Structure 1
Amino acid sequence: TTHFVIIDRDGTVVSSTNTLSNFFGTGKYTAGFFLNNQLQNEPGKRSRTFMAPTVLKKDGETIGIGSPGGNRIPQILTPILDKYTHGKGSLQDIINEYRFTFEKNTAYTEIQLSSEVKNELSRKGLNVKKKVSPAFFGGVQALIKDERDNVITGAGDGRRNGTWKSN
């Protein structure tokens, strides 16, 4: 899965996420490309996906954002948008913050945490687990246009060697 964002001259924003489901899909390979894997979630129907390309708009601000990472997608994006809207700092900075996701009473962590914290969370029935794969926590890609004047900025997720540019 991969997500990208584009903003053009007259402030059109595209926010798009494409995928094979698994890495390499089923791994089956023909005429130069990998065939998708279809997760079972009747003939011509599409399955549910957690993917969520999104745009945010205020007066003087346009945000496009999204991320891979399967069923962790809303968990990846919620804290970032939360921190960001509450003035906590530059979008890139926030993308850089260490991350956690939950799977039914297991909290998965990007960076290993203190005893203090591990106990407090043990008390709520959760058992912290640190995870090795940096890609497990997504690949958030975002752009921001503001009307000062205008400046585009954005974020690329170094966990998937992601990046961004504006003129």
Structure 2
Amino acid sequence: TTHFVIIDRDGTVVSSTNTLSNFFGTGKYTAGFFLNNQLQNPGKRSRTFMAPTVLKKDGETIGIGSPGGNRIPQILTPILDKYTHGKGSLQDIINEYRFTFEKNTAYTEIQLSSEVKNELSRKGLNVKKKVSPAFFGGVQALIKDERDNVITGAGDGRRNGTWKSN
């Protein structure tokens, strides 16, 4: 899965997520390309947690999205929560270590303290550190300041994400 965001001179925002559904799909390969695997989640489309998104207010436009399978909205929600409540730059927030939940487990990007682990233990979530950066996604975003007319962005180092504006 890959997510990109584009904003043009007309202020049109595209937010797109494309995928093969596992890295190199099924791995089957023909005519120079890899074939997707289809999750069983005729011409039916399966359910996906992909969620390309745009947010707009007077004065601000945001295009945002992420890869990360069934974790996607778990990845995006704390990011947008912190951003809209003033915690810092979208890029700093994106850089912050992440966590997601799967049934009763909390997957954590860093080693948490015994202090916080035990609070979660009697909650009672158990905690497990995931060793793949790609597991916690790859958030890509652009933000247009609509007053002043400037575009900034953020990319996720977990995927070597970057951004540019004019």
Q: TM-score range by the shorter chain?
A: over 0.9
TM-superposed CA distance for 1:125, in Å, is: 1.3
Distance, in Å, in 2 between the alignment partners of 1:108 and 1:130 is: 6
Deviation readout 1:117-156 (Å, 9 max, x if unpaired): 0000001010010010000000000000012411111110
Distance, in Å, in 2 between the alignment partners of 1:107 and 1:16 is: 28
TM-superposed CA distance for 1:87, in Å, is: 0.5
Q: May I ask how many residue pairs the two structures share in their alignment? A: 166
Distance, in Å, in 1 between the alignment partners of 2:143 and 2:101 is: 28
Deviation readout 1:74-106 (Å, 9 max, x if unpaired): 000000000000011111111000000000010
TM-superposed CA distance for 1:10, in Å, is: 1.1
Aligned residue in 2 for 1:35 = 35
Deviation readout 1:25-53 (Å, 9 max, x if unpaired): 00000010000000001x01100000000
Contact 2:49 2:69 in 1 (8 A): yes
Distance, in Å, in 1 between the alignment partners of 2:147 and 2:164 is: 17
Distance, in Å, in 1 between the alignment partners of 2:93 and 2:153 is: 11
Query: Match of 2:101, SS?
Result: strand
Contact 2:60 2:147 in 1 (8 A): no
Distance, in Å, in 2 between the alignment partners of 1:75 and 1:104 is: 13
Deviation readout 1:1-33 (Å, 9 max, x if unpaired): 000000000100000000000000000000100
Aligned residue in 1 for 2:47 = 48
Length-normalised TM-score, structure 2: 0.99
Length-normalised TM-score, structure 1: 0.98
RMSD: 0.6
Distance, in Å, in 2 between the alignment partners of 1:147 and 1:75 is: 28
Contact 2:64 2:142 in 1 (8 A): yes
Distance, in Å, in 2 between the alignment partners of 1:64 and 1:147 is: 13
Runs of 4+ residues over 2 Å off in structure 1: none
5+ long unaligned stretches in structure 2: none
Query: Match of 1:128, SS?
Result: strand
Distance, in Å, in 2 between the alignment partners of 1:116 and 1:150 is: 46
Distance, in Å, in 1 between the alignment partners of 2:97 and 2:154 is: 15
